[PDB]
Amino acid sequence: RRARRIPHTAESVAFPLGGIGTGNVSLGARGELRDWEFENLPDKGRLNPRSFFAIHAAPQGGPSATRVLEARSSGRHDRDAGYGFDELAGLPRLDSAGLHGEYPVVDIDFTDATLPVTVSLHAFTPLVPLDADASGIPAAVLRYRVVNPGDAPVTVTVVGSMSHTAGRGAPGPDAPWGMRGTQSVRWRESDGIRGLDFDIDLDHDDPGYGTMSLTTTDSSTTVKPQWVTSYWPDGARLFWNDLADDGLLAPEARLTLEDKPRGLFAERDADPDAPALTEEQMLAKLPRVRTGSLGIVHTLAPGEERDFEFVLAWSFPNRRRGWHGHIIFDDALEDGAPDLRDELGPIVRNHYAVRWPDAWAAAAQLHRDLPALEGATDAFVEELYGGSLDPVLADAVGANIAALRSTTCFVLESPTPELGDGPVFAAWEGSFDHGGSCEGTCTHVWSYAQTAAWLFPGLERSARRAEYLLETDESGAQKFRGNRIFGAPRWFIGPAVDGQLGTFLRLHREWRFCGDDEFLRELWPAAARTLDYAAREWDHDGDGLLDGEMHNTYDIEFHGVEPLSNIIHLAALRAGVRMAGHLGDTARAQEWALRADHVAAAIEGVLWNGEYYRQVIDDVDAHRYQYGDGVLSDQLLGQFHAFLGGLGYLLPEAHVRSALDAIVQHNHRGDLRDHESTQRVYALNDEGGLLLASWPEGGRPALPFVYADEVWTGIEHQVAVSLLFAGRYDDALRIERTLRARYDGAHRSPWNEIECGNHYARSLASWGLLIGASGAQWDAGARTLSFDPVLPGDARFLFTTATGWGGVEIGDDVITLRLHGGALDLDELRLRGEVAGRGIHLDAGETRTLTLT
Amino acid sequence: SRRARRIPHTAESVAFPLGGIGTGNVSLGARGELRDWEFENLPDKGRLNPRSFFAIHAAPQGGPSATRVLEARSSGRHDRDAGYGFDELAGLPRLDSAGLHGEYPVVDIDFTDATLPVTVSLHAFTPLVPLDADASGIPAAVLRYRVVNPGDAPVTVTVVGSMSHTAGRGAPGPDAPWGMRGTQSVRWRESDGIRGLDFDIDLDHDDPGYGTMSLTTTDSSTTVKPQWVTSYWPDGARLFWNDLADDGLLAPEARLTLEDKPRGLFAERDADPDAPALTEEQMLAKLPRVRTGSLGIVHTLAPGEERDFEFVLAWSFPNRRRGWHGHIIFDDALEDGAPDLRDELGPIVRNHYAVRWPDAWAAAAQLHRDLPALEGATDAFVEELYGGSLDPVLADAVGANIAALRSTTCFVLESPTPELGDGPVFAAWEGSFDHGGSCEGTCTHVWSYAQTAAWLFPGLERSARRAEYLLETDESGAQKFRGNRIFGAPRWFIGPAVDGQLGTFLRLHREWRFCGDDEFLRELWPAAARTLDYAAREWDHDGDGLLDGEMHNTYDIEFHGVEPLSNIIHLAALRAGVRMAGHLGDTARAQEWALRADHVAAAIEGVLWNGEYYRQVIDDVDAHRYQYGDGVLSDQLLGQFHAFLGGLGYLLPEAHVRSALDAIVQHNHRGDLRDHESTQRVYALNDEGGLLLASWPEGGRPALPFVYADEVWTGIEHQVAVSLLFAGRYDDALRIERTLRARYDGAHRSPWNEIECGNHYARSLASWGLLIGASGAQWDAGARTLSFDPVLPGDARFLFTTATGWGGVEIGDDVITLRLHGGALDLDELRLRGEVAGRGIHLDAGETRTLTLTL
Ligand SMILES: [Cl-]
Ligand SMILES: [Mg+2]
Ligand SMILES: [Mg+2]
Ligand SMILES: [Mg+2]
Ligand SMILES: [Mg+2]
Ligand SMILES: [Mg+2]
Ligand SMILES: [Mg+2]
Ligand SMILES: [Mg+2]
Ligand SMILES: [Mg+2]
Ligand SMILES: [Mg+2]
Ligand SMILES: [Mg+2]
Ligand SMILES: [Mg+2]
Ligand SMILES: [Mg+2]
Ligand SMILES: [Mg+2]
Ligand SMILES: [Mg+2]
Ligand SMILES: [Mg+2]
């Protein structure tokens, strides 16, 4: 296998299935399902009762074997009440496993000393670049490949057993058995698929309502649609008895073995010769989760390999209207915007529910379209992980896509009439284990996130329209957390300099990617105002440099004069000139171009110290949370945006390189055992990482900004991307190797970079590594595509554009474009600053090799 | 040189619990970290106490200083969802490694580090004084850091404890800003011969969440920051570390907040933007409500010098909400009969320890003032339990499991019900979930397994027997197996369990035999005798003397047919009944019971014995769910465990008892569980071993056997190993114990926490019987006789207890020595291996007597 084998003992490792906005379930390195979080909230560590795969292998004329299809557990076994009944941890398992993840696809290869067959699991949820719907199906393929390496036929049953997740409620008389409603399960065969269809009797508009399914297209099935529900776990024992007996299953004659509540379960007030309860009446007194099993049965010849293919699908269509987070409280709202919530009502739907209002619909789609969906997914994996990128960089780019497809992000169906009809992308900053982290598609965080802008640009556009149409007032003040997507009044807190101007940079990015001038024009009156706001409101001494108190991503305000704000502003001005001039807004184009030149001069005159850019302040201790002559890792965040936006260097190339080099030299730690931090920990011990700031020349405040001693993968990524554009390949690679080692499975999961929450949005800065490594520059307005790889010689990269995606392959004398999705109609193709092709058009499925001479 | 085997700092499960009987607890991990902060009348495994940690500043003369948290480095998962948070101070430098050496109640944690210019060890304990439940119930612990200077220059060392109070948390909402329903306080205090930090909270004194804490020393060489800065951001910790790492000295903060008014993200929406600053007091009212302080002790160590930096951590949460408030005995499960006193009695029951000690400081002051005697007793205990002849495996099993008795699982109430009169009453959960009690009501079917308190704190067990007989036993002799009436509530409506009810009667005999108090027995005797007669009357439907048909038991199901668990317990109960009846002059009842017992033993042999073991006789093992038939039930001879411990000897032919025990071992013990198939709960798995509850070596497995048959319970493992020691099957006892304790050797589970339905599970207290069976200790307080009969020949040395006193017994063929460490002992006879060693032996604490044995 190409991916690195992660052993079954790496307990943190979780490979997430599910798509954009769908919610998720993960596979651990034991091959177990974990982190069941379908229900519009995170739920790391949620155990789904009785939900597992199992194998019965019956060698012809030989003893049978029956195992759960999981490697052995390891680690702490001191659960407070033991592993519970519903975990079935006492059933026999496979000795070991290795997990090989190339997100969105995983392979988990099992090893066992005695099982008479060998097993692997291939799993994925499709990902189709530029197709957010196809990439947002609430379902996953679970495909178990079984090999008979023995000399006699083996009859193999692979059986998924599953419980629906819906229905939990807080303990109480409205939630007997912790369940607010009662589940159902049945066998179903319709829509070209067969299997188990789960439901619940909650109201159609209850936020907790949802469905699940476990299906196959395999005709060779054996089923127990509904396990027995008794007070004791009879269901499970009967299931195992049924499976290990013969590798076949039957429906249960009786759905409960209780006649009436007795012994410990007796109702104190029951009439002791009440009439017999019907089974339905007895079921009404019992636990409300339901479980079924779908088995697929094949006799494998000596040597034969066969796939046992399932789909697991789910649908929780209803969200409560509002973030219901921990920041934007209904008493932290400012007056001024109409409160639409009573009129619009208490629910907003997930977008995915328009096509797939229940699990069956999603399953049926995934099975019907599997060749194309899988074909796309596989082409994506091959381009992303099978080209010339160093494996570390492919890992950083690819694995972090998981954040975009996690509970951190979601897509709402028409949440507010003010944006018109259609999907609106919105996101937390991250996911706490059990709730959202930091609501409002936070602009100072999300400005670092690049992945969606290149893979699902539609989503990012929908978000920019919320910020400009709803969250930007007449003066140009833009909220950095948005509440108006729900119809709710705005958050009362004011603008952040990085969030407001980062948003403006993202408007440029979005427009550059799609080429849609109408998109830009709609947002332009508000966007221009936000750029004007900065020079007017944030420069108190009229020198062109933003100064004094401005709020930033560090949750504090910087004072004095300093590069984070100023270099972002410089980039925004440059972007603003491009957009203004294109749109014919000649007054702003001129005004901003003058301003930009003046700012760049003033940055070099004031903030540059001959090695890096730093904060000019009278007294670094006069206000808490400053940094002064410290080296701020984000000093050049503006330049990261500029490189990615095709704006090149904002400042003298040698000065930018010096500054980057200072960041690497001073702020990168190979080992953190001696680091003296009172802050949050995302790197420690024998790990390394880029610090947010350090003070190599002294001047450390008593109380520096409150995250200065921390390590943020997002900042690591942005700096590495800048280093790539600057030609500092070795250092970018070292940053990325070091940070991804913290996420190699030993202590943290590859598919979950963390900050304030799991699947943290800043981690999506990582996509810029592909861009920087390849020097990809797509301008949809010019219809030009160019590459300029940092490393010389032969190369092969994934690329995206608005209209199409594929692979680029570069040699001495030729460049090849192969398109896997959509279409490409280039005015011009450039390689290393030279014209490689004019008028170059390709359709999906076509390859063109162009001579460079 | 440490006697306990070294547990590495990488063993994440390991937690050495400080605290005493009924006090609540905090634990030490193998990194030397404090963890599992659970002082407040409920379990709380995994609760992190913000800003609560020890650190060292080591300033070598003429060398670079080192400032470190006095913990080894963490080593497992680091993927906390938000990172390690500010208040964990996980980004401060730590030590390369540590080795934990626990001989409960004492622990030593030895740090190793390549950069620190001194070497550090932590010695910690909460005193344990056998037979003194109060002295063993101090809500405090000693934390004594030994620092050695192995280098070549003097080093000025500061060892600093920083600590937050735990009190005040509230459910999310407007009255719990920052998650805190009250505001804590901390101050420097010097009083009662001690000094340090005194923590309080502005909750009402009767609030269940009210309490205090203290961190004190008697060292005069202190440096202190009594109250860290409270700002919106964690300025306090930054200032703390700047202050420590600068010079190893601390100062009080001139400003208790660095906020002038709420600003920025914390600004109040409606505030006037140019509002003036608030006072410091008004500003603190708007800020987080936990308070932190730091007590440092400073000494300069010459090359080769060592010094103790001694702290005491103490706490007090005096108030419990009246009632179990568990998950079984809800209002819809309450019986009409006994009237509801709850409204008449008032909403709070106090912890017993809160009678003696008003607050944390009081308990700290006691512990410091009395420390030489308390520690002396504790050290003498440790030496007898762990420094004698027992195989270390056995000493481990006996001593580690005491933790359960001193955990949140158990507590002691001040006078919860007028119906028992005034005084402390012991009560217990079966266990402790991570964040709540497991299975309320001093459950009798579970607690009948527990032996530790009956030998170490018998008074506690007597107080509980009174609740059962006076409160939970009706006029027919039906006894509840979960007791709600201690709180003045109606009884639970569920009826008796055969093992619970008869197990409690066996424990009455046990308690009476230990103490020799006929008045204790007489008060309970009418109720107790009715509970024994209840069995033969109500549970034998075919007149054969054997209990038959539907009887509920510890497996939470009912056995049908006729089967040994019930019947061999009954046999044992009858034999104990005869002793008690005979002594009290209830001569007619003694005779009746003796003859009934003779008939029961004969019927057991004639019906339940199959030539190899005892089993369930039933027409169809599948006619009723949850049976076992011809399976081997590990608990078949539980009655015989009681009988052995109660001095009653073999209940059945010796060869048959040994055969059955051998069959339990042979059939139900597993060295490895890779091949095991269980749809049940997991307490043992994979490459572990254990004793299964049942197995079917000759077939006859029901489709749905009892619901725990395929499980492994340490309590059952212990009871069987105890019986095996009595029966002379030492090797097999040791094997069961070796295998079970290996499950709790720190690799996957903690030595100090055997688990079943909950942490610190009461059944694990069967482990005390290993000492009794290994030593063959037989104490009869009514006869004033003490005998030993060790399973292994030759020289031996054991802990022993009696009602009046405790100590060490040293045995050879030439002499037997008693050394009494506490109390007194007045023996009419001392016997060894059935022979009189001496008569008229009178010892006081601190004395020894060595008797030469006859040739
Ligand atoms: Cl899109
Ligand atoms: Mg959790
Ligand atoms: Mg349905
Ligand atoms: Mg079958
Ligand atoms: Mg200025
Ligand atoms: Mg490591
Ligand atoms: Mg075509
Ligand atoms: Mg075309
Ligand atoms: Mg917990
Ligand atoms: Mg006080
Ligand atoms: Mg100082
Ligand atoms: Mg009866
Ligand atoms: Mg009978
Ligand atoms: Mg082994
Ligand atoms: Mg192991
Ligand atoms: Mg000798």
Q: Could you say which of A233, A263, A758 has the minimum Cβ distance to residue B81? A: A758
Which of B459, B384, B400 lies closest to B807, judged by CA? B384
B360 alpha carbon – ligand 10 mean position (Å): 8
Ligand 10 is an ion; its neighbours by CB within 5 Å are B 200
Q: What share of chain A is helix, strand, coil (3-state, %, to 5)?
A: 30, 25, 45
Dist CA A349 CA B631 (whole Å): 56
Ligand 1 is an ion; its neighbours by CB within 5 Å are A 132, 456, 458
Cβ A79 vs Cβ A92: under 8 Å: no
Kindly determine whether residue A73 and residue B115, on different chains, have CB atoms separated by under 8 Å.
no
Query: Chain A closest CA to B496's CA: distance in Å?
Result: 11
Examine the domain organization and report whether A830 and A757 are in the same domain. no
Q: Which domain holds residue B725?
A: 389-775
Kindly determine whether residue A90 and residue B681, on different chains, have CB atoms separated by under 8 Å.
yes
A chain contacts of residue B756, beta-carbon cutoff 8 Å: 81-82
Q: What share of chain B is helix, strand, coil (3-state, %, to 5)?
A: 30, 25, 45
B431 alpha carbon – ligand 9 mean position (Å): 15
Kindly determine whether residue B91 and residue A680, on different chains, have CB atoms separated by under 8 Å.
yes
H or E, element range at B244: helix B235-247
Which of A377, A389, A379, A385 lies closest to A810, judged by CA? A389
Domain boundary residue, one of B751, B775, B799: B775
Q: Could you say which of B81, B434, B703 has the minimum Cβ distance to residue A754? A: B81
H or E, element range at B638: helix B638-645
Which one-letter amino acid corresponds to residue B35?
R
| Residue carrying the six token digits 């059986």 | A159
B chain contacts of residue A64, beta-carbon cutoff 8 Å: none
Which of A126, A114, A98 lies closest to A27, judged by CA? A98
The enclosing domain of B825 has a CATH number of 2.60.420
Dist CA B26 CA A639 (whole Å): 51
Examine the domain organization and report whether A713 and A840 are in the same domain. no
Kindly determine whether residue A493 and residue B265, on different chains, have CB atoms separated by under 8 Å.
yes
A12 alpha carbon – ligand 2 mean position (Å): 13
Kindly determine whether residue A706 and residue B74, on different chains, have CB atoms separated by under 8 Å.
no
Within a domain: B159: yes
Kindly determine whether residue A82 and residue B683, on different chains, have CB atoms separated by under 8 Å.
yes
Domain boundary residue, one of A774, A795, A811: A774
A chain contacts of residue B12, beta-carbon cutoff 8 Å: 76
CB atoms under 10 Å from CB of B599, counted, come to: 16
A284 alpha carbon – ligand 4 mean position (Å): 28
Q: Which ligand is nearest to the CA of B548?
A: 13
Which one-letter amino acid corresponds to residue B127?
P
Examine the domain organization and report whether A207 and A296 are in the same domain. yes
Substitution target in B36, B65, B78 with the highest count of A β-carbons within 10 Å is B78
Cβ B470 vs Cβ B460: under 8 Å: no
CB atoms under 10 Å from CB of B189, counted, come to: 16
What's the domain count of chain A?
Answer: 3
Q: Could you say which of A81, A84, A95 has the minimum Cβ distance to residue B758? A: A81
Q: Which ligand is nearest to the CA of A822?
A: 8
Kindly determine whether residue B686 and residue A73, on different chains, have CB atoms separated by under 8 Å.
yes
Within a domain: A328: no
Query: Chain B closest CA to A745's CA: distance in Å?
Result: 9
Structure-block tokens of residue B23: 């006090």
Q: Could you say which of A78, A555, A747 has the minimum Cβ distance to residue B750? A: A78
Task: Provide the 3-class DSSP secondary structure of residue B324.
Answer: coil
Dist CA A89 CA A71 (whole Å): 11
Within a domain: B334: no
Cβ A765 vs Cβ A714: under 8 Å: yes
Kindly determine whether residue A82 and residue B241, on different chains, have CB atoms separated by under 8 Å.
no
Dist CA B25 CA A827 (whole Å): 74
Closest chain A residue to the Cα of B432, Cα to Cα: A80
Kindly determine whether residue B680 and residue A90, on different chains, have CB atoms separated by under 8 Å.
yes
Examine the domain organization and report whether B129 and B203 are in the same domain. yes
Which of B300, B704, B79 lies closest to A35, judged by CA? B79
Kindly give the pairing relationship between strand B437-438 and strand A211-216: unpaired
* Apex A802 CA angle, A796 and A805, nearest 5: 30
Examine the domain organization and report whether B739 and B840 are in the same domain. no
Examine the domain organization and report whether A179 and A234 are in the same domain. yes
Alpha-helical runs (H) found in B516-563: 518-538
Which of A24, A20, A42, A22 lies closest to A33, judged by CA? A24
Dist CA B333 CA B315 (whole Å): 36
Which of A83, A195, A747, A129 lies closest to A457, judged by CA? A129
Dist CA B791 CA B775 (whole Å): 7
Examine the domain organization and report whether A21 and A127 are in the same domain. yes
Kindly give the pairing relationship between strand A33-37 and strand A24-28: antiparallel
Strand partners, B112: B97
Within a domain: A369: no
Within a domain: A383: no
CB pairs under 8 A between A and B: 231
B chain contacts of residue A756, beta-carbon cutoff 8 Å: 82-83
A441 alpha carbon – ligand 10 mean position (Å): 46
Which of B86, B82, B759 lies closest to A759, judged by CA? B82
Structure-block tokens of residue A451: 């992945």
Of the CA atoms within 13 Å of residue A470, those in its CB half-sphere come to 30
Examine the domain organization and report whether B838 and B737 are in the same domain. no
Examine the domain organization and report whether B689 and B815 are in the same domain. no
User: Angle between the B638-645 and B714-726 helix axes, to the nearest 10 degrees?
Assistant: 60
Kindly determine whether residue B92 and residue A240, on different chains, have CB atoms separated by under 8 Å.
no
Kindly determine whether residue A234 and residue B758, on different chains, have CB atoms separated by under 8 Å.
no
Q: Could you say which of A433, A625, A676 has the minimum Cβ distance to residue B92? A: A676
B554 alpha carbon – ligand 13 mean position (Å): 21
Kindly determine whether residue B258 and residue A703, on different chains, have CB atoms separated by under 8 Å.
yes
Q: Could you say which of A66, A268, A747 has the minimum Cβ distance to residue B77? A: A747
B chain contacts of residue A747, beta-carbon cutoff 8 Å: 76-79
User: Angle between the B564-584 and B498-515 helix axes, to the nearest 10 degrees?
Assistant: 40
Kindly determine whether residue A756 and residue B82, on different chains, have CB atoms separated by under 8 Å.
yes
Which one-letter amino acid corresponds to residue B651?
L
| Residue carrying the six token digits 């209840």 | B534
Q: Could you say which of A78, A237, A681 has the minimum Cβ distance to residue B753? A: A78
Structure-block tokens of residue B701: 């497995």
A chain contacts of residue B332, beta-carbon cutoff 8 Å: 268-269
Dist CA B326 CA A726 (whole Å): 64
Which of B357, B355, B354, B316 lies closest to B166, judged by CA? B316
Q: Which ligand is nearest to the CA of A742?
A: 6
Kindly determine whether residue B237 and residue A79, on different chains, have CB atoms separated by under 8 Å.
no
DSSP string, B573-602: HHHHHHHHHHHHT-HHHHHHHHHHHHHHHH
B120 alpha carbon – ligand 15 mean position (Å): 30
Kindly determine whether residue A757 and residue B82, on different chains, have CB atoms separated by under 8 Å.
yes
Task: Provide the 3-class DSSP secondary structure of residue B470.
Answer: helix
Q: Could you say which of B67, B241, B265 has the minimum Cβ distance to residue A678? A: B241
Kindly determine whether residue A78 and residue B749, on different chains, have CB atoms separated by under 8 Å.
yes
Within a domain: A320: no
Length of chain A: 853
Cβ B677 vs Cβ B526: under 8 Å: no
A chain contacts of residue B30, beta-carbon cutoff 8 Å: none
Dist CA B360 CA B140 (whole Å): 8
The enclosing domain of A198 has a CATH number of 2.70.98
Examine the domain organization and report whether A74 and A152 are in the same domain. yes
Kindly give the pairing relationship between strand A154-163 and strand A139-147: unpaired
Kindly give the pairing relationship between strand B785-788 and strand B815-832: parallel
Examine the domain organization and report whether B624 and B732 are in the same domain. yes
The enclosing domain of B650 has a CATH number of 1.50.10.10
Cβ A458 vs Cβ A513: under 8 Å: no
Dist CA A44 CA A408 (whole Å): 12
Kindly give the pairing relationship between strand A814-825 and strand A847-851: antiparallel
- Following CA atoms B266, B270, B275, B278 in sequence, which dihedral angle do they give, to the nearest 10 degrees? -50
Domain boundary residue, one of B321, B339, B365: B321
B233 class by beta-carbon count within 10 Å (0-12 exposed, 13-18 middle, 19+ buried)? buried
Structure-block tokens of residue B429: 């959960």
CA quadruple A588, A590, A592, A593: dihedral sign: positive
Within a domain: A674: yes
Q: Could you say which of B13, B81, B91 has the minimum Cβ distance to residue A432? A: B81
Cβ B511 vs Cβ B465: under 8 Å: yes
Within a domain: A331: no
Sheet holding A291-300, edge to edge: A65-68, A52-59, A154-163, A291-300, A221-224
Cβ A848 vs Cβ A840: under 8 Å: yes
Kindly determine whether residue A678 and residue B234, on different chains, have CB atoms separated by under 8 Å.
yes
Q: Could you say which of A79, A264, A333 has the minimum Cβ distance to residue B494? A: A264
Dist CA B676 CA A66 (whole Å): 11
Which of B290, B311, B232, B436 lies closest to B56, judged by CA? B311
SS (H, E, C) A469-536: HHCECCCCCECCCCCHHHCCCCECCCCEHHHHHHHHHHHHHHHHHHCCHHHHHHHHHHHHHHHHHHHH
Substitution target in A6, A41, A50, A80 with the highest count of B β-carbons within 10 Å is A80
Dist CA A578 CA A570 (whole Å): 13
Kindly determine whether residue B242 and residue A702, on different chains, have CB atoms separated by under 8 Å.
yes
Examine the domain organization and report whether B788 and B762 are in the same domain. no
Query: Chain A closest CA to B708's CA: distance in Å?
Result: 10
| Residue carrying the six token digits 């604490």 | B845
Kindly determine whether residue B82 and residue A432, on different chains, have CB atoms separated by under 8 Å.
yes
